[PDB]
Amino acid sequence: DRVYIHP
Protein backbone atom coordinates (compact mmCIF):
# COMPACT_ATOMS: atom_id res chain seq x y z
CA ASP A 1 0.00 0.00 0.00
CA ARG A 2 1.08 3.66 0.26
CA VAL A 3 4.11 4.77 2.32
CA TYR A 4 5.70 8.22 2.24
CA ILE A 5 4.47 8.07 -1.37
CA HIS A 6 3.84 11.81 -1.93
CA PRO A 7 2.53 13.42 -5.13
Curated annotation (Swiss-Prot):
Domain of life: Eukaryota
Beta-decarboxylated aspartate: residues carrying this PTM: D1
Role according to the record: Is a ligand for the G-protein coupled receptor MAS1. Has vasodilator and antidiuretic effects. Has an antithrombotic effect that involves MAS1-mediated release of nitric oxide from platelets.
Name of this chain's protein: Angiotensin 1-7
Organism encoding this protein: Homo sapiens (Human)
Organism ancestry: Eukaryota, Metazoa, Chordata, Craniata, Vertebrata
